[PDB]
Ligand binder design. Sequence first.
Ligand SMILES: C#CCNC[C@H]1O[C@@H](n2cnc3c(N)ncnc32)[C@H](O)[C@@H]1O
Ligand SMILES: C#CCNC[C@H]1O[C@@H](n2cnc3c(N)ncnc32)[C@H](O)[C@@H]1O
Ligand SMILES: C#CCNC[C@H]1O[C@@H](n2cnc3c(N)ncnc32)[C@H](O)[C@@H]1O
Ligand SMILES: C#CCNC[C@H]1O[C@@H](n2cnc3c(N)ncnc32)[C@H](O)[C@@H]1O
Ligand SMILES: C#CCNC[C@H]1O[C@@H](n2cnc3c(N)ncnc32)[C@H](O)[C@@H]1O
Ligand SMILES: C#CCNC[C@H]1O[C@@H](n2cnc3c(N)ncnc32)[C@H](O)[C@@H]1O
Ligand SMILES: C#CCNC[C@H]1O[C@@H](n2cnc3c(N)ncnc32)[C@H](O)[C@@H]1O
Ligand SMILES: C#CCNC[C@H]1O[C@@H](n2cnc3c(N)ncnc32)[C@H](O)[C@@H]1O
Lengths: 258, 258, 258, 258
Amino acid sequence: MKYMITSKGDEKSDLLRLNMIAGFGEYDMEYDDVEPEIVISIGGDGTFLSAFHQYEERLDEIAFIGIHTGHLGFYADWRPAEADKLVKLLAKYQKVSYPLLKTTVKYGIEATYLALNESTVKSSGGPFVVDVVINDIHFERFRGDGLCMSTPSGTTAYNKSLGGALMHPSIEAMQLTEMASINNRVYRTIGSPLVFPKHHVVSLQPVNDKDFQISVDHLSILHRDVQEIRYEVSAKKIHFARFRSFPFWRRVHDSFIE
Amino acid sequence: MKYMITSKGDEKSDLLRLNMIAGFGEYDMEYDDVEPEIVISIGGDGTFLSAFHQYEERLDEIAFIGIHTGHLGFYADWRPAEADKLVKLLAKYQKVSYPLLKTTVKYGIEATYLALNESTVKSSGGPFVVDVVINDIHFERFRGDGLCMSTPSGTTAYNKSLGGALMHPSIEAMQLTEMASINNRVYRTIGSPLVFPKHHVVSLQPVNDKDFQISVDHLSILHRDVQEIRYEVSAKKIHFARFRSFPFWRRVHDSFIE
Amino acid sequence: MKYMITSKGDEKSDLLRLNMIAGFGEYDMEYDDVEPEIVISIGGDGTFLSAFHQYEERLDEIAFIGIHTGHLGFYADWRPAEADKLVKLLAKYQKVSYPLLKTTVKYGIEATYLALNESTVKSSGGPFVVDVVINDIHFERFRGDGLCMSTPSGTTAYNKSLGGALMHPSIEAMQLTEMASINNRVYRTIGSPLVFPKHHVVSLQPVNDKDFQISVDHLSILHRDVQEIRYEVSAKKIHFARFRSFPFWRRVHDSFIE
Amino acid sequence: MKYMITSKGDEKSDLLRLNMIAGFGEYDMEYDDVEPEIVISIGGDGTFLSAFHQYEERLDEIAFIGIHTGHLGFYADWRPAEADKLVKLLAKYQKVSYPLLKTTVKYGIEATYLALNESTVKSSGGPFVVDVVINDIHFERFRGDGLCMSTPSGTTAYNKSLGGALMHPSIEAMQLTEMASINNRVYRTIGSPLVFPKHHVVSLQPVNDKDFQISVDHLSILHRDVQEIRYEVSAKKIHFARFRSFPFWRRVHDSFIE
Ligand SMILES: C#CCNC[C@H]1O[C@@H](n2cnc3c(N)ncnc32)[C@H](O)[C@@H]1O
Ligand SMILES: C#CCNC[C@H]1O[C@@H](n2cnc3c(N)ncnc32)[C@H](O)[C@@H]1O
Ligand SMILES: C#CCNC[C@H]1O[C@@H](n2cnc3c(N)ncnc32)[C@H](O)[C@@H]1O
Ligand SMILES: C#CCNC[C@H]1O[C@@H](n2cnc3c(N)ncnc32)[C@H](O)[C@@H]1O
Ligand SMILES: C#CCNC[C@H]1O[C@@H](n2cnc3c(N)ncnc32)[C@H](O)[C@@H]1O
Ligand SMILES: C#CCNC[C@H]1O[C@@H](n2cnc3c(N)ncnc32)[C@H](O)[C@@H]1O
Ligand SMILES: C#CCNC[C@H]1O[C@@H](n2cnc3c(N)ncnc32)[C@H](O)[C@@H]1O
Ligand SMILES: C#CCNC[C@H]1O[C@@H](n2cnc3c(N)ncnc32)[C@H](O)[C@@H]1O
């Protein structure tokens, strides 16, 4: 099977990567970073995020696995001492799929992005005001720092810091959370996080300023002359290679409780 | 079609109820409060809640409709001036189903409940401490005022006041929110609301005191010698008669924004 | 100097208490639990709370000291291994004063309480609705689970779990926090915690039900036929014997961060 | 008395300003925008903020008054229809003082600012990590979007959106609130807002990146090679001319409740 390994680039990760490649050399496995069927990320969740975005055009043909050389990750959920066991098992597994978020940005005179964690919108030097439209229905006028749209697996990330709910990645949904919304006699937002099912479309529409700083996972870009930002649950899914049970809620416990 | 009408019991509601019955008298419709196929609730959400619990043993055979004589309700979402139009249309509609929550209470030496909004657990005079177990995995030891498990339609109720997320009722899920959790160097809870898919089981297990005040929607009972409280998404669903489009998110907007 | 020692009543605490009494026997110190000038509490914050309430009528004549036999407390902030050192130093110190909360309860056809942590109000079986009046000005109609009024030192307790701010006990103030407030198009509360200076009076006035469950620190009582609940910063203060520097913010760090 | 009037610069405000100047012409009053003793701001809170910062070097010699031509402001708390009455009364009042925040920024190889609302710190393109030090004691390592330090009158502004408490401006204090803090098994912040008395010093110290976007009220500047950011309650106070009673809590009610 064609495979590749990305590394965080520190000593520990590169040596682990060389050792796994050497071990893969003892099996019918071809290193190929152009059309891999297996993508191993060694590092942290940041490293895994880059791996996903490197190959986001071949998601349906790839199964991902993350090894954590630092602390336990939500995506990089296997330990280095288990690398040898991982080599063997991979050589000869079930696949687990998580939902992704599609962001569409439209301009004047169109770009789409795929997120594994979340997409966020803030202003580019000035007050952030957008009209929030759900399935063509005007829902609210949002004034604040910005907004965040999370995938289920993303809910443990930025979404969590914003008071969002944690949702099991088996739920095909996206979650919208507010950043520092203004609420007074005049201005009014829902306050609560909002969880949207598949096929629902959330559109953000500029009121005055049309420039926005938009993020998708790690990447943050200043967009100019924006007419609309559309969020929806993607038709695409990320696929993980599963070798043993490590339940999401146990992953949550291990990361946040103890 | 067999039908019945419950009233809040104030003047406005009883007169509206008598008028609809009179109007139903002009069609092939039989009043029957034992085996109705249609249950009309006239009043508020509290009135609708009682209607649901009155007939919770025939949910699969009943389509519910709520008329709001006071303010707009999430369940009682039609206006009194539309009663005549409702009579006609009902006489000769699509059905919309929402998920429900199953609560199981086990003792020493077993009772099950169905909730349309939520079930909550608090202590009966003393400190509340329970072990939270998700699919047989110990997740956290909760210390605080109590816990709340909400259906999707319930998310706009008690759940919302506790910082929970609002979720579209098309999502088959339940949501657990904390009431005043203690978090310090010693005690540790997740903090965030948790959203569970169908088939996941959340079990609350006593640590010391075994007496608990348990609520299901409007009903609140002191339970004694409790060994376990199990929450899961019910196999049963509530069915609404749908006569026109009134999207959940528009219902949310109308109730909270303007 | 006249002194007494209260114990949590477990083995560790009673033996520590007997040893300190024996050690005090080597100095000019008289055990007197009627008119002590020094009150030593051995146990946890709960034990210290009881010590305070046991002698709340002689606060101006007493200096308190807490020893923690369990985990570190905010009031019981000295370790058992330091008991001998405490005996000596006490025998031959500076005094530190913290603000207290006065609760007044008025009826039909008047009772006052002093709180070291907080006073809370909830309903006694039913919906909680009160009108909140600040210095005779109607501020809001509160609908929810209840309300909590905290002293500065209390801010690390129940107040913290409710999203309240932590405030240095050198600030003569009280802080009002909400429990699960209902906010929609119809009902409206401030949401935010409110911090009141000395001489401001917060009055809670019943709207419908006049029965309330009122707590002051550890004690919780059902009050009947209530006409008003008044909160204000007390003229009285609790006095601590200070033997070394242990800054409030360090106490906060040690208890919550690490 | 020497005086000046600043305007928002819209039609309504300029005409109101010309009319008040004309009316002042009927009294012993000299327009002087260099050394005024009275500064009238006509517009909104933004306009008032600029007025304050225009004259922040003569705060002890100036009494401020705000007129709101748009919605009611916390600083601009008088209505246009009352301009004539204001002219008269000012011609021949009590003074009310609010606390201010001092921000000190130190570099490598020192700048101080005065805030009426708040000062905030965020990163300049990258992860925000700072060590929070209170009176020379290391309190926490903060990871998140940023931090906000509010004056009492500022507590109704940005501070409120971040979950901060509202505090009466008679309390000489500052309040620190978190923006989207990361909390997991590894990283740990207090969570709660923190209220500091006069003479307490809060120092933010860089961990890695030394570039920060720092705001003081309306002004936001990228600071380079920062070694420390110090916050403390200022010795300086803003003085308002008071003509009638308009209690802070009533101002809060009018702005947020109804
Ligand atoms: C910018 C930046 C770094 N912040 C990322 C932190 O969040 C973590 N993270 C990334 N993705 C997730 C995630 N999906 N769930 C929980 N934590 C996550 C990452 O491990 C790190 O702890
Ligand atoms: C890991 C990693 C790489 N950083 C990207 C992730 O950082 C996470 N993040 C950024 N800011 C915060 C934040 N302020 N709190 C928690 N997570 C955050 C966010 O989820 C994003 O996907
Ligand atoms: C006890 C009590 C009364 N509190 C109930 C309030 O919440 C409302 N309520 C009941 N169910 C829901 C609901 N499902 N969503 C939003 N509000 C709801 C009810 O209308 C009323 O406004
Ligand atoms: C309507 C109605 C009947 N009351 C029952 C409902 O009241 C709701 N409720 C009770 N307490 C609160 C509350 N404190 N905030 C918001 N909703 C609440 C809860 O959802 C429950 O189902
Ligand atoms: C009922 C009950 C027990 N909950 C009390 C918990 O809060 C603690 N507590 C009591 N007073 C304070 C306090 N003033 N600050 C922080 N924690 C406090 C006590 O130590 C224990 O951890
Ligand atoms: C200690 C001790 C004795 N218990 C009394 C204290 O418990 C504290 N408390 C009660 N409930 C909670 C709570 N739910 N969260 C945090 N602290 C709480 C409260 O401050 C009260 O003064
Ligand atoms: C950037 C920007 C605009 N946001 C400012 C909003 O907050 C308001 N504001 C400014 N200062 C305060 C303030 N001190 N209290 C409450 N609101 C304030 C201002 O009126 C406006 O409503
Ligand atoms: C008014 C005015 C001028 N804008 C400055 C003020 O805007 C306020 N502000 C900026 N962002 C927010 C915000 N996100 N929510 C509430 N208030 C905000 C902040 O207090 C600042 O002093």
